[PDB]
Design a protein around this nucleic acid. Structure first.
Ligand SMILES: [Zn+2]
Ligand SMILES: [Zn+2]
Lengths: 56, 193
RNA sequence: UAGGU
């Protein structure tokens, strides 16, 4: 099979590249909630009406 | 005479909304007189109002052209990396418009339709920058048919209120590093078999 | 209900 041939071929040319799952992300704004909303889920916050989309 | 002519998805299709079919967003929203067919299967997802351009806030115009470039690169990196955990990201587009329907819209086209469905199922319960993220499947397929032409060459006279996508492109260095990083991550999740 | 087939 050439599958393991091309996989190790691609890996070797990308030796000095970091995989995307490893990348150190400084100041990642994901999962950051506003103060006081630690116990509020994202679904409950959207239905509350405090976080409307600009269209509405 | 090689094939029948059609008008579906065009601005002559007076029943379906051409703008929602191509751009995935319409200024009229849910009150539109024309049809917005929301796909049940799609490779592309939509996260509206995800990107808040600092230039549209107080102290926005307190930044240099280099600082603004590094800040948007930080956002595009933060977007691409997180969306990659759901599947192979074919393209990531960030809209710099100011219209209510397109402001800060983040479109993500995955390689498989299952990766797009898994993304919206997980994103709709997550937060980003102290705001809950809205995620949905988008009918957008070819971004060339949704981008503004006069904005690519020179500037568009309609400005930020243009109803076509005014995509903000990241640095080519970051985009290249992201595509190579995803290929390695995908290649590493292949040597296990 | 448009500028974009
Ligand atoms: Zn519409
Ligand atoms: Zn434009």
């Amino acid at each position: 099979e050439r599958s393991v041939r091309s996989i190790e071929q691609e890996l070797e040319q990308l030796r000095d590249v970091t995989p995307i799952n490893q990348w150190k992300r400084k100041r990642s704004l994901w999962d950051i909630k506003p103060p006081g909303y630690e116990l509020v889920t994202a679904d409950q916050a959207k239905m509350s009406g405090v976080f409307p989309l600009p269209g509405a | 005479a090689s094939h029948l002519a059609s008008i579906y998805g065009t601005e002559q299709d007076k029943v379906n909304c051409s703008f929602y079919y191509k751009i995935g967003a319409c200024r009229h929203g849910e009150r539109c007189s024309r049809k917005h067919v929301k796909p049940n299967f799609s490779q592309t997802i939509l996260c509206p109002n995800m990107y808040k351009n600092p230039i549209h806030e107080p102290n926005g115009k307190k930044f240099t052209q280099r600082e603004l470039a590094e800040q948007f690169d930080a956002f595009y990196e933060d977007m691409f990396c997180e969306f990659s955990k759901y599947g192979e990201v074919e393209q990531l587009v960030v809209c710099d418009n100011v219209g209510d329907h397109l402001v800060g819209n983040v479109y993500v086209r995955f390689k498989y339709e299952e990766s797009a469905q898994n993304a919206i199922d997980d994103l709709n319960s997550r937060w980003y920058s102290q705001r809950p993220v809205y995620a949905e499947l988008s009918p957008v397929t070819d971004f060339r048919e949704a981008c503004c032409r006069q904005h690519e060459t020179s500037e568009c006279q309609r400005g930020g209120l243009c109803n076509f996508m005014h995509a903000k492109k990241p640095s080519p260095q970051l985009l290249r590093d992201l595509v190579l990083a995803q290929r390695k991550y995908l290649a590493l999740n292949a040597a296990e078999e």
